[PDB]
């Protein structure tokens, strides 16, 4: 899986969540999307690719990942309480994260 | 400030912004907009006063303004930056934020 | 309250959590918290006090206590769910952002 | 990585980390700690292999490498300035959230 297949995955299980129907099925998207963010943190975006490893930017790029995986740990939380609704409401706001990396480095 | 004050703070600066011709107005604006959307984020509102502190309902007002400080954060890094443009199309790209709660809440 | 007694707040307000019998008594402590950080997060410490406000130390000091809130959220939601001893753990492993952000600018 | 890998990777990059003499070097060996400390995140531990991931045991687990990685960022900082005795005392400091982990689930 490299940084493409990972948005795939992220961007797949947002509208999992949103369609899902139990805390199970919120539960296992949102676990997705963890493991999925946590590969996607080390990798260098074609944006960023001719700056420096060690630039403020690719600091910034490592660091949107840290938000969002403490974002979907909240989401989870609320999920593992069996609260669906509340924790399909947590999905839908990762997407001001999401966008808030895309609009710096996609 | 109360609920309505802390709103019309953030309304009249996003106009402010939307006018801006520099980043010194712009970032001012922001500056203000923080700190009405952290006052506004303690205050329970009216269809919601009869509802429990860690209500689904309480949660997810508090929480809207968690995403609306952060893309108020994002903003203030491009007014920063001196990227007037940019940070009016964020500040523009906030009202989605707005939209939300009060489709729920106001 | 100056920063000094906000961080007389923190460390009071721990010892309290520590200590406590129940949710509820938890939960005041952990709001109280919240608080006193967002409150010292709008001071300019004495160690950076001949800094720009915009600075990149002053930007990381208002930060850490970010941080510090999202943590103290993370823990009220342990409480809210009657885990009593877990957010007391919660609230106890606050020390290490205390400890960064005192290495940094204490 | 298996658990033990990770766990020796973090043992081995200590003691690079006290033997070194320059910031530099510092730096270099944390970055290795962060990727195997994410790495052993992952693992369930021989003692709570009974366990599901959810119980308290297991959450307090995984919040630990949270706080180690979140230790090792901030000692990474200080040798990213060069602040070579201030990194090492930072890594040395790691030690604790090493011994309190060892001491409830090793
Ligand atoms: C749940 C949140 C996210 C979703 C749903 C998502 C979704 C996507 C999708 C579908 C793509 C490919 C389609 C396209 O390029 O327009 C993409 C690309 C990309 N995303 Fe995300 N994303 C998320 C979060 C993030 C975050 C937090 C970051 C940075 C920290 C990020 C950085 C990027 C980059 C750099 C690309 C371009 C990759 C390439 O061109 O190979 N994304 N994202
Ligand atoms: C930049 C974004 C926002 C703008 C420009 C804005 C603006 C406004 C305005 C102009 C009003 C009219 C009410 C009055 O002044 O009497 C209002 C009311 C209200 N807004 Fe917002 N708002 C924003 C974001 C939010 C958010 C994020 C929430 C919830 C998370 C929210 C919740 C409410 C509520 C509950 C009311 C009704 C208050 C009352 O009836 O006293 N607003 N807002
Ligand atoms: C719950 C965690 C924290 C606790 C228990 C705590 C506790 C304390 C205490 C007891 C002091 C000495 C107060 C005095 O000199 O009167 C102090 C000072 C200080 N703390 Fe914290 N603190 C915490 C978090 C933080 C954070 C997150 C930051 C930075 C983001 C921070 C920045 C400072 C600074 C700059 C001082 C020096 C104050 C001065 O010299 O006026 N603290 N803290
Ligand atoms: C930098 C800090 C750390 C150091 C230096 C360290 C060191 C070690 C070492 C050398 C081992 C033995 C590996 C072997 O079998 O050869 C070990 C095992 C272990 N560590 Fe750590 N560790 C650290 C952090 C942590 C943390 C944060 C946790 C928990 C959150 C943890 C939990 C464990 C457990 C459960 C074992 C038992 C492994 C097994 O028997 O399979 N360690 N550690
Ligand atoms: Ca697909
Ligand atoms: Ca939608
Ligand atoms: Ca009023
Ligand atoms: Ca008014
Ligand atoms: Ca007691
Ligand atoms: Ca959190
Ligand atoms: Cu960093
Ligand atoms: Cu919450
Ligand atoms: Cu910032
Ligand atoms: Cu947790």
Redesign the interface.
């Known amino acids: 899986a490299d940084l493409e297949d990972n948005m795939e995955t992220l961007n797949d299980n947002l509208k999992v969540i949103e369609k899902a129907d139990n805390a199970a099925q919120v539960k296992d998207a949102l676990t997705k999307m963890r493991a999925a963010a946590?590969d996607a943190q080390?990798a260098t975006p074609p944006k960023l690719e001719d700056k420096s490893p060690?630039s403020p930017e690719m600091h910034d790029f490592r660091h949107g990942f840290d938000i969002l995986v403490?974002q979907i740990?909240?989401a989870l939380?609320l999920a593992?309480?069996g609260?669906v609704?509340?924790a399909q409401?947590?999905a839908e706001?990762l997407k001001?994260?999401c966008?808030?990396c895309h609009?710096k480095y996609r």
Request: charged share 35%; net charge negative; hydrophobic share 20%.
């Open positions: 946590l080390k060690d403490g740990h909240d939380h593992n309480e609260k609704k509340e409401a947590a706001q001001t994260t966008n808030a609009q």
